[PDB]
């Protein structure tokens, strides 16, 4: 009955992690797995460069300092410097409630407004344990105000009208924010760290086998040019071809293209004369006739792409969109032309196999969840990281995170999708008849009866967000942007004459917070030129 | 105007007069809220235990400092529950039997939060340690200062009143109801109807339009709150709603008890519930200022009343026949569905477990807490209804599953109680938390309100390691990461440090509970 200490070493770990992919998943995992495994494992980083990453992926969210960049020792001016960063303080929707050709102008709404609405990363201050947006639905279902969620419950909406940044010149913080930067030059400045600082080591070649034993465990990568390269544990980073979870390991992905039905994209950067306009502290969905284009501002150019279904326009149809929403010439335009999966392997973690990036699970870059997939999965790899014998339940548990996760941000997206009022193309109206999720029917269901979805809630705390991380704040920011509102307002309300009284204090401390911010702040343009010292 | 005027709540108690201070302060004079209690005078002296987020979750919310309810009902602090006699066979002792190592069985289950490195809790640096041979020390010992702290029976806050440690509080139930009577009247302007309920009146749609007292006042009302104790005259009498009867989860279904004055003098007061174990069950030990609440909790499948009352008698040294002794017998497990049409279901008239971790009061304030977020119009629309419901299930089926561990997790065999437990089949959740915890993975991490997000899984990591490894349920093998981490364990070496050093310090300048209570409650 007693505890039998098991025997004195004999070293059951891990002694070498392959990781197959040098973009921005390769060598966030290489970095991270670096800093975790604290120089008793070999990292090998396998990538070719004959075969071009993927290219994009600019945008975040904000969990990005905390959850990884804290991880590695890295502050957050540090790594901004190094990859052109700029500040995202939301996803700003164009276009998404009118009819019509992609234009980055938004059109009139019937009420007079511009076609735009915000989805911010400010939290929504409270009364009487109820979130400021509810107190909002209620009046305007009460026929109290006409103003728009993101106007009446956010500074951050009057702050980037002005294009004025999340922080001061003294850089102490006004709002949350997240980030937009250069994808090259984050893959760069990570790579340099893994390799200078984590001890990893690079090789430069193409794999052109995977060796397994009997059991189909693999054991090393045969390449090009002739090296096997053995190893225990495999990071699948190969990107959507899925070389090592799909091809190799031969886990099916799940398809779910009925769930979200954009699949490509044509995308380009854009020099850009800050002088002139200014930098948005934001990035910009622009609707098009087929899916949206994102714009992504940081110092001299801004990052661009069209998402589409190729079900609904083809890549000429596409570019020609494109380049005209910007007078791009599309015989001189060097554009990136990707296709894109959307779904999740039935399993990330199979045998010594672990997929990572887009060789793992992915949903159209909406809402930046891409890069936010590669560390929350580092995370949790680090976290259920495995000996030689695998067990088993760390496997299922570390599957089990990232199946939640993944769901969890599909719900969100499925959102802007499915109450779009736009009928005009084929692509609008088939987003009408998408198959909707079983959870975010409920969370519509709760939402319609006036409840919040999902209300906010240190390593514990930021973990936990991975299984709910779109709160509610951000579904008010959705639907309500859309034009789904509550069927009613929370009923609560009807007998709280102080606590509405409260609420209409805070929604007089967020006009008088915009007009102050927007008069004090700094331009996002000169607040980039002092961080990146261009001035 | 679809909106409540009139919300009946039937019963007092704490679940009555509870539910009635809180949505008397909820809904700020907009609605009309009546208590119907029978006089029933004869209120006893019957201490009760709580969890941690008391204050927080309730007492704040009516805007009550702590140490104002505290010195009307003789409340005394409580950093955990001390589990005596779990593991080794024989009668009902309050002094604890040796192990096998020398050790007493005894093992606590603290409040404290457990620091980590490297994102990586002690529990686990401890639990690597204890597989790998490097350590004979006990979790409790190892990972909470606030073991020494109670070992010691000094108390969790400074003379000066600041804190030293997480807590929750002992009461006297009665006194609490009187309280918040008195608060909810006085402040809340809650009507108190002193009468009998003889008829409740329903709709051809079920739903409740009056209940009738036997003065022959008829009470209307658009919401009823069923505060009417294990009977369940509205939610299962006059609605129908049926009793899912959990049984197969859980065997205790009756309790003796008495109030057992205690010589502080002499012996101090222990700032903890004691939960003694017995040959059919166990016995509480809720101290406060002057007396113990005490209770044999059991089966009557397994025990007589007598049985029971001689053996409880017996743990004490008590004259059977010269004590003041309550019998009940329990309900154990839910309502199907806690609120139906306009009657919701509060305290034992919707769900109950024995108080093995002090639930009772906190399914009161959880599901008062989330009736008020759903609080519905007259139209009852059927979303609110189900979410509440989905609350209800969800965080009783968790402490449900939470407790079954205590039992099913107990190495004892020598009576057909404890050979009984084993019998059962374990719960999905916990075969799942047990799985999770044998690989060394972390169960139900700590996130620090959302202190309502605290209730879907409000045991956390901390709190399954006290009762499995307090049980002797350990992992199968450390958390694999620790095998490449040599400076993360260096780090929780020092961690292991800081715990002993806290241990020490805090002994030495702390008061004892005695001392703290003689001060609070302004003895003299
Ligand atoms: C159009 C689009 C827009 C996106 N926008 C965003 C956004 O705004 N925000 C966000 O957070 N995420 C976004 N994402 C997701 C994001 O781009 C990715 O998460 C991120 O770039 C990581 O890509 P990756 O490293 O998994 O794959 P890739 O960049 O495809 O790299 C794969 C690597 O595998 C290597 N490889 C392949 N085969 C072999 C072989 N045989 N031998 C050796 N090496 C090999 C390649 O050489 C390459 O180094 C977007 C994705 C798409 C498609
Ligand atoms: N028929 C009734 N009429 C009024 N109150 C009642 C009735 N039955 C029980 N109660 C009250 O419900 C509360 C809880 O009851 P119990 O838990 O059975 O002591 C007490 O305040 C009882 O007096």
């Given at each position: 009955?007693?505890?039998?200490?098991?025997?004195?070493?004999?070293?059951?770990?891990?002694?070498?992690?392959?990781?197959?992919?040098?973009?921005?998943?390769?060598?966030?995992?290489?970095?991270?797995?670096?800093?975790?495994?604290?120089?008793?494992?070999?990292?090998?980083?396998?990538?070719?460069?004959?075969?071009?990453?993927?290219?994009?992926?600019?945008?975040?969210?904000?969990?990005?300092?905390?959850?990884?960049?804290?991880?590695?020792?890295?502050?957050?001016?540090?790594?901004?410097?190094?990859?052109?960063?700029?500040?995202?303080?939301?996803?700003?929707?164009?276009?998404?409630?009118?009819?019509?050709?992609?234009?980055?102008?938004?059109?009139?709404?019937?009420?007079?407004?511009?076609?735009?609405?915000?989805?911010?990363?400010?939290?929504?201050?409270?009364?009487?344990?109820?979130?400021?947006?509810?107190?909002?639905?209620?009046?305007?279902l009460q026929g109290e105000t006409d103003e728009n969620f993101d106007e009446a419950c956010f500074?951050?909406?009057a702050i980037m009208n002005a294009k004025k940044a999340p922080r001061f010149l003294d850089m102490?913080?006004?709002?949350?924010?997240?980030?937009?930067?250069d994808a090259s030059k984050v893959a760069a400045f990570l790579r340099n760290f893994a390799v200078?600082?984590?001890?990893?080591?690079?090789?430069?070649?193409?794999?052109?086998?995977?060796?397994?034993?009997?059991?189909?465990?693999?054991?090393?990568?045969?390449?090009?040019?002739?090296?096997?390269?053995?190893?225990?544990?495999?990071?699948?980073?190969?990107?959507?071809?899925?070389?090592?979870?799909?091809?190799?390991?031969?886990?099916?992905?799940?398809?779910?293209?009925?769930?979200?039905?954009?699949?490509?994209?044509?995308?380009?950067?854009?020099?850009?004369?800050?002088?002139?306009?200014?930098?948005?502290?934001?990035?910009?969905?622009?609707?098009?006739?087929?899916?949206?284009?994102?714009?992504?501002?940081?110092?001299?150019?801004?990052?661009?792409?069209?998402?589409?279904?190729?079900?609904?326009?083809?890549?000429?149809?596409?570019?020609?969109?494109?380049?005209?929403?910007?007078?791009?010439?599309?015989?001189?335009?060097?554009?990136?032309?990707?296709?894109?999966?959307?779904?999740?392997?039935?399993?990330?973690?199979?045998?010594?196999?672990?997929?990572?990036?887009?060789?793992?699970?992915?949903?159209?870059?909406?809402?930046?969840?891409?890069?936010?997939?590669?560390?929350?999965?580092?995370?949790?790899?680090?976290?259920?990281?495995?000996?030689?014998?695998?067990?088993?339940?760390?496997?299922?548990?570390?599957?089990?995170?990232?199946?939640?996760?993944?769901?969890?941000?599909?719900?969100?997206?499925?959102?802007?999708?499915?109450?779009?009022?736009?009928?005009?193309?084929?692509?609008?109206?088939?987003?009408?008849?998408?198959?909707?999720?079983?959870?975010?029917?409920?969370?519509?269901?709760?939402?319609?009866?006036?409840?919040?979805?999902?209300?906010?809630?240190?390593?514990?705390?930021?973990?936990?967000?991975?299984?709910?991380?779109?709160?509610?704040?951000?579904?008010?920011?959705?639907?309500?942007?859309?034009?789904?509102?509550?069927?009613?307002?929370?009923?609560?309300?009807?007998?709280?004459?102080?606590?509405?009284?409260?609420?209409?204090?805070?929604?007089?401390?967020?006009?008088?917070?915009?007009?102050?911010?927007?008069?004090?702040?700094?331009?996002?343009?000169?607040?980039?030129?002092?961080?990146?010292?261009?001035?």
């Amino acid at each position: 009955s007693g505890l039998v200490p098991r025997g004195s070493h004999m070293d059951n770990r891990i002694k070498t992690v392959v990781i197959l992919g040098g973009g921005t998943a390769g060598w966030m995992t290489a970095a991270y797995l670096g800093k975790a495994l604290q120089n008793t494992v070999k990292i090998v980083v396998l990538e070719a460069p004959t075969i071009p990453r993927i290219g994009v992926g600019e945008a975040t969210v904000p969990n990005l300092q905390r959850a990884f960049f804290d991880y590695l020792g890295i502050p957050e001016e540090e790594w901004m410097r190094e990859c052109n960063a700029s500040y995202k303080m939301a996803v700003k929707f164009i276009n998404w409630r009118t009819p019509g050709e992609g234009s980055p102008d938004p059109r009139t709404l019937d009420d007079g407004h511009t076609d735009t609405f915000h989805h911010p990363f400010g939290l929504l201050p409270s009364a009487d344990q109820i979130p400021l947006s509810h107190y909002w639905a209620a009046k305007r279902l009460q026929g109290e105000t006409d103003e728009n969620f993101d106007e009446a419950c956010f500074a951050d909406t009057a702050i980037m009208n002005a294009k004025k940044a999340p922080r001061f010149l003294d850089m102490r913080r006004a709002t949350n924010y997240a980030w937009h930067f250069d994808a090259s030059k984050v893959a760069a400045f990570l790579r340099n760290f893994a390799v200078t600082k984590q001890a990893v080591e690079h090789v430069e070649d193409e794999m052109t086998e995977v060796l397994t034993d009997e059991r189909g465990f693999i054991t090393a990568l045969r390449t090009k040019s002739g090296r096997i390269l053995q190893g225990d544990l495999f990071v699948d980073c190969s990107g959507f071809r899925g070389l090592l979870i799909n091809k190799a390991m031969e886990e099916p992905f799940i398809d779910m293209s009925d769930h979200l039905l954009c699949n490509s994209a044509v995308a380009t950067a854009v020099p850009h004369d800050d002088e002139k306009n200014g930098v948005e502290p934001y990035t910009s969905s622009i609707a098009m006739e087929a899916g949206w284009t994102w714009k992504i501002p940081m110092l001299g150019r801004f990052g661009s792409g069209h998402v589409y279904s190729d079900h609904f326009a083809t890549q000429d149809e596409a570019t020609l969109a494109f380049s005209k929403l910007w007078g791009l010439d599309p015989d001189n335009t060097e554009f990136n032309h990707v296709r894109f999966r959307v779904g999740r392997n039935r399993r990330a973690w199979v045998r010594n196999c672990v997929s990572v990036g887009l060789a793992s699970c992915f949903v159209e870059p909406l809402e930046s969840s891409g890069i936010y997939f590669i560390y929350a999965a580092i995370h949790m790899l680090a976290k259920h990281f495995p000996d030689k014998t695998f067990d088993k339940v760390l496997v299922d548990r570390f599957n089990r995170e990232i199946e939640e996760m993944f769901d969890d941000t599909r719900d969100f997206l499925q959102a802007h999708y499915y109450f779009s009022p736009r009928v005009d193309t084929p692509f609008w109206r088939a987003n009408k008849e998408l198959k909707l999720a079983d959870s975010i029917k409920d969370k519509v269901e709760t939402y319609r009866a006036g409840l919040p979805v999902n209300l906010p809630v240190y390593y514990g705390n930021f973990e936990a967000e991975f299984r709910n991380f779109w709160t509610n704040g951000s579904y008010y920011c959705i639907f309500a942007g859309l034009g789904l509102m509550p069927r009613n307002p929370l009923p609560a309300l009807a007998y709280k004459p102080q606590s509405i009284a409260e609420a209409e204090l805070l929604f007089a401390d967020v006009k008088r917070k915009g007009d102050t911010l927007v008069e004090s702040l700094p331009s996002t343009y000169d607040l980039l030129r002092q961080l990146h010292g261009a001035s």
